[PDB]
């Protein structure tokens, strides 16, 4: 037959794929293969759309067919790499990309896909070089440009930052106008100066990818319950998460399933990840009424069937657009009410989510247009943490008077009070109050342990541990799986912090910092002569960039001190050494905001307009420290400078945080669960009365 026939079907299918007509594309590809069975391009193109539909094994089969027909078919190798990467076979992906680039060194797409492996592997310098090769070969390449831009964000390379933001916004505008998937990921859109409409549109279009993967299942709509009779009057809530394990989300809410009222609620936890063997997974499996390992049910149709058979009334999406999500489960709507909660700081933009659980501080009603969901308000803040359960050894502290400071040499421990009963020369300072160990024999031995770098010592039968050696003493304590047994010593000397100056800290990933933020921090340090900035090597290759820009702003290098990433327990504990935390305005600290407040460290924040830029102020409002919340950059700076220069004020504010972390609702998981339950019932009564979702802002 004429070659134009199969060629025309293949090329028309390519167009249909571009337009989003995936089902039509599949038909045309398969008809092309009917007309011309040995059609390498059609095999590879078909496999591309099957990949997009989640039919990964069938895609692999057709990639291999294409390559059998054409051993040097570089397109097919690069496309196959993308499928192996999605299947988590990183080595196979690399072997495919390196083969494609060996066949065709000028293959722009293959260089950019290779770069995505280096980016995910933590090799940012090599990712950057490969993205730049891709853009050299194909100067108009939105995927490469935007992922390169995020590489540069990660390492705080701000070269031509203003022009980078221009082009990012231009790319998104063009892709949205042309009905294409934006090359900016929803979770990254918060970092760039895009309109709220663009951010919600980015999210909606990423959610539509889930539709392509469920439509091939041809499942009918689910019949949903309209009463609680089958559940004996109990409301069935299902928590869906890939992060039941050693993950920050468990560090936040692992207590909540077990605190639900069993008289009125039946709790189902659907894990999207296998059991990692940590106590976090043990606890949720033991305390939930039911625990379902969906990682054993990879078909989203069969997994949604399981949710529906359990009779779930409210299904809670804890992933949003993060690693491990299976939002296909929510697209299938196995429950009549589906809510976003906690794990993802932003809107799904998707029709299959009814609510986002938030609060009036985080998401004031006047910005409801930023969200596709209806707002459902928790009464104080929607954020929560398990710090009271995980880190009770930090509820009290004592210090050593090496001369009195509350944050130069710090001891914490469960048996710390019992220990101090034995030391007759301890002094009690009332700003609860703080015991002060004088510079005696015991104190000298503790300081000798730190200076000498010993792991622990024993005094009066009490184990005293070096705070830098927790993983050698008890790995489960370092991770937060268990409460440390010993008395732990934490000191500014351990981290190179000055003994006689103000320490401002921020322990966030460096990509949450932008030039405007560092300039603001620079203005503060210039106004507090005795002061340094304490930051984290995340990643370390960002350190020289921050240092270079800080010096361009008039800050010498010795004003910024970096520490490595620490295990969870040390990370929270060493926050006690700072005087003040400077929150990132672009995207706040979220978990890290809870962490510093639990240590008693005041956090200064300037809430923005996005959900992610307003969480810290929501936390401080619940805590009851409205004076740490700035309305603009001037106020942010003035607040931080006053804290660093008026030491009586600093003592007062730190005392407020230290006390109100306990007395306010911020860390009260029992009160949170109770209020969360009241919110679920408002949702259920609303649905049971035959109403579509509406704002629950009271």
């Amino acid at each position: 037959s004429c070659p134009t026939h199969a060629d025309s079907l293949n090329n028309l299918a390519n167009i249909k794929r571009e337009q989003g007509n995936i089902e039509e594309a599949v038909r045309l590809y398969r008809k092309a293969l009917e007309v011309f069975p040995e059609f390498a391009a059609a095999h590879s193109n078909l496999a591309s759309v099957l990949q997009q539909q989640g039919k990964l094994q069938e895609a692999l089969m057709h990639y291999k067919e294409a390559i059998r027909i054409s051993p040097t078919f570089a397109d097919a190798y690069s496309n196959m790499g993308n499928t192996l990467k999605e299947m988590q076979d990183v080595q196979g992906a690399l072997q495919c990309y390196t083969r494609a680039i060996q066949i065709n060194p000028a293959f722009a797409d293959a260089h950019s896909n290779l770069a995505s492996i280096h980016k995910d592997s933590g090799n940012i310098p090599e990712a950057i070089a490969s993205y730049r090769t891709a853009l050299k070969l194909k100067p108009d390449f939105p995927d490469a440009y935007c992922n390169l831009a995020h590489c540069l964000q990660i390492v705080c390379d701000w070269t031509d930052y203003d022009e980078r933001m221009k082009k990012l916004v231009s790319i998104v505008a063009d892709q949205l106008e042309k009905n294409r998937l934006p090359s900016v990921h929803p979770h990254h859109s918060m970092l760039y100066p895009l309109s709220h409409g663009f951010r919600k549109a980015i999210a909606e279009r990423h959610g539509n990818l889930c539709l392509d993967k469920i439509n091939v299942l041809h499942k009918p709509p689910y019949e949903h319950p309209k009463d609680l009779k089958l559940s004996d009057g109990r409301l069935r809530v299902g928590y869906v998460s890939s992060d039941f394990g050693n993950h920050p989300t468990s560090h936040l809410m692992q207590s909540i399933p077990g605190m639900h009222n069993p008289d009125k609620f039946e709790v189902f936890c659907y894990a999207l990840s296998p059991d990692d063997g940590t106590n976090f997974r043990v606890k949720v499996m033991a305390e939930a009424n039911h625990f379902i390992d969906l990682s054993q049910i990879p078909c989203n149709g069969k997994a949604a069937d399981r949710i529906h058979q359990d009779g779930i009334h409210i299904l809670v999406n804890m992933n949003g657009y993060t690693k491990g999500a299976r939002n296909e489960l929510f697209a299938l709507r196995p429950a009549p009410i589906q809510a976003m909660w906690l794990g993802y700081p932003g809107t799904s933009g998707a029709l299959f989510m009814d609510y986002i659980i938030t609060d009036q501080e985080t998401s004031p009603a006047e910005v409801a247009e930023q969200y596709s969901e209806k707002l459902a308000y928790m009464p104080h803040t929607f954020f929560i943490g398990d710090h009271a359960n995980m880190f009770p050894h930090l509820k009290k502290k004592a210090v050593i008077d090496f001369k009195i400071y509350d944050n130069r040499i710090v001891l914490n421990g469960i048996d710390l009070k019992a220990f101090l009963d034995s030391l007759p020369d301890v002094k009690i300072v009332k700003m609860l109050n703080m015991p002060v160990i004088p510079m005696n024999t015991i104190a000298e031995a503790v300081i000798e342990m730190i200076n000498r770098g010993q792991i622990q010592i024993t005094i009066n039968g009490f184990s005293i541990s070096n705070g830098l050696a927790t993983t050698q003493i008890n790995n489960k304590a370092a991770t937060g799986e268990e409460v440390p047994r010993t008395i732990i010593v934490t000191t500014r000397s351990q981290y190179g912090l000055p003994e006689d100056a103000i320490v401002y800290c921020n322990f966030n990933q460096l990509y949450k910092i932008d030039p405007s933020t560092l300039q603001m921090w620079a203005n503060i340090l210039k106004r507090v002569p005795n002061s340094v900035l304490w930051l984290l090597r995340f990643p370390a290759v960002g350190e020289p960039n921050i240092q270079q820009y800080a010096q361009n702003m008039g800050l010498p290098q010795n004003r910024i001190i970096f520490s490595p990433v620490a295990p969870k327990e040390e990370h929270v504990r060493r926050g006690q050494l700072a005087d003040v935390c400077l929150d990132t305005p672009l995207c706040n600290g979220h978990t890290t905001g809870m962490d510093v407040l639990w240590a008693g460290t005041p956090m200064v924040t300037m809430p923005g307009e996005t959900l992610a830029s307003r969480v810290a102020a929501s936390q401080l409002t619940c805590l009851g420290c409205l004076e740490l919340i700035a309305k603009n950059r001037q106020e942010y700076e003035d607040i931080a400078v006053k804290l660093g220069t008026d030491l009586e004020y600093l003592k007062k504010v730190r005392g407020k945080v230290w006390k109100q972390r306990i007395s306010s609702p911020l860390f009260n998981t029992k009160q949170y669960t109770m209020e969360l339950e009241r919110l679920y019932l408002q949702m259920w009564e609303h649905y049971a009365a035959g109403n579509k979702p509406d704002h629950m802002i009271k």
Binding site: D75, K85, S116, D120, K323
Partner: peptide, 14 residues
């Protein structure tokens, strides 16, 4: 962190 998206290549038949 999530996995970085990739770019599929559409092959034109000639």
């Amino acid at each position: 962190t999530h996995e970085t998206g990739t770019t599929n290549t559409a092959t034109t038949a000639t």
